Amino acid sequence: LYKKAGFMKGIYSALMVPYNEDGSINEKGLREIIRYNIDKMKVDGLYVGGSTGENFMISTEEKKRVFEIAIDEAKDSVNLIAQVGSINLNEAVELGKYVTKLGYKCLSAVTPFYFDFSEIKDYYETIVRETGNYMIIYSIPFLTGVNMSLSQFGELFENEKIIGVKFTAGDFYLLERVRKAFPDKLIFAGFDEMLLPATVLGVDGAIGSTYNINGIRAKQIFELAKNSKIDEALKIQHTTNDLIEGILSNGLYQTIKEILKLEGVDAGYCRKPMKKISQKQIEFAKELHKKFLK
Amino acid sequence: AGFMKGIYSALMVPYNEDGSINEKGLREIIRYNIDKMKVDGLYVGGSTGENFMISTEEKKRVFEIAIDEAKDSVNLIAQVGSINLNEAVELGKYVTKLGYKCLSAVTPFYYKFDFSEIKDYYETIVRETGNYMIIYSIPFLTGVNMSLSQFGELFENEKIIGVKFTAGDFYLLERVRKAFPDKLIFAGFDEMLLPATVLGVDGAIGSTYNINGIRAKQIFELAKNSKIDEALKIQHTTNDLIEGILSNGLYQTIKEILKLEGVDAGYCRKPMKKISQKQIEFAKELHKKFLK
């Protein structure tokens, strides 16, 4: 339908945040990662604040500082989505209000793992109505759960400001059903290693962490599959998944940071008392870079 | 084995009230698949044929009729797997003698066999029959989840020529396709035919092709030939039909639609529930909207 926010289509990097040794934000490194994504990966958008290991119990003051820097550095060059969930509802509202005042024009949220569908719906609709901003839902509204039902999607998509969904589990029957039932909503693939089969089911783009270093190939897959070049897209998805297979066996986030540094980006190391990367994983990351990205 | 590519119906079998085979109706279902659905092949003795609900002798009679009626007009695969390896070899030898040129076998289930035992099972059927083998992988029913390196171990056997892939794991599907470009991969999930096709599967084996095989071949061919937009529209229409089939009872609704198409599709094996008035009328509406 013509009412879709079609300008939002494309490849979004789940923005990696670098940290200093003491745990604070490496603001200079963060600006380098933003610039690398915009200028070298050529991403269509940035997805800021997704919950990972190092992201989760960081202070909201540091969450806010990441949001300020990201929109200051990106300006209006790419689309932005700010994830403001994974915290209590009143906390998520004050964060949604803050990023809205900063100028973010689209929110996303996943709920905390405390549950009933009425509580999920109220969580989303509260953020929307208290911030006045647009909202991308998650297909799985918390971690240890499963994808929502088709009629639950309808309850949420009844809200005009709930404009799309990040699809995080690869149920491709449900993905087809959601695409058919809501042609006016955006669907973003959350699974980088399944971008090609998602693209032919009509997803509007993809949100992923590997696009920080593999955004060029990802954009090629998306574009070729939508323009009658499926054989070429499949070969690039094959190459991409050789890289992803190695990234996954070597530790996803620590390997992305190592390859960023091999590309000259001051990405540091994984934060917190999160497990230190090993000498063997350092060497494997170097081999992955030489073979796939150098 | 490139000549085996394409769309295979998992052949349904009509049973009488007492569970015995309705031979007249079985020939009618075969004729409908070959002549009207225009399938490239028949997958005989699979889950869809209620294979695991019937006796060894009843399985043999289904295999006899199917190849007698189909002759060499379409490809034929005979599913001979079982928890009983001695039965699997017996059935595999029997259908090989009948003239079937390719076997399939579900992973042995119920007991928690480890992978070395699963490998012995496949290699034993191949060794004892001399026939080709397609791995039947269906974790939703068996609980057996096979790794990429485990597929590699099985695929070192030159007569294990492919896999019927029913796990909805499209990362694993892409990894198997890349690792084994010389093997056949058949999609087992009719409602995900389009995404599987663009990952390079060689065909599909499905229950809904007994009645929706025309659209299935369209999706497959269009997606391989730079018509993705058209293939998605037909997958969308197909999945409206499949969504109704699933809500109405899969086996009962396919058999009911076959009857609306003039094919005597008989009953399901007990304890499969008999179809209800509500389900009969729903099937009539699916037929009128999607297939008449």
Residue numbers in the entry:
A (entry chain B): -6 to 107, 110 to 289
B (entry chain A): -2 to 289
From the publication, what sentences describe this entry?
The crystals of ligand-bound FnNanA with a pyruvate Schiff base intermediate belonged to space group P21212 and diffracted to 1.76 Å resolution. The two monomers that were identified appear to form a tetramer with a similar monomer arrangement to those in sialic acid aldolases from other species. The structure has 0.17% Ramachandran outliers. All residues were modelled into electron density, except for Tyr108 and Lys109 of chain B in ligand-bound FnNanA with a pyruvate Schiff base and the residues at the N-termini of all monomers. In addition, the Tyr133 side chain makes a hydrogen bond to the hydroxyl group of Ser44 and a conserved water molecule. Tyr133 lies almost parallel to the Schiff base intermediate and is engaged in hydrogen bonding for the Schiff base reaction.
N-Acetyl-d-neuraminic acid lyase (NanA; EC 4.1.3.3) is also known as sialic acid aldolase. Sequence alignment showed that FnNanA contains conserved catalytic sites (Lys161 and Tyr133) and the conserved specific substrate (Neu5Ac) binding motif GXXGE.
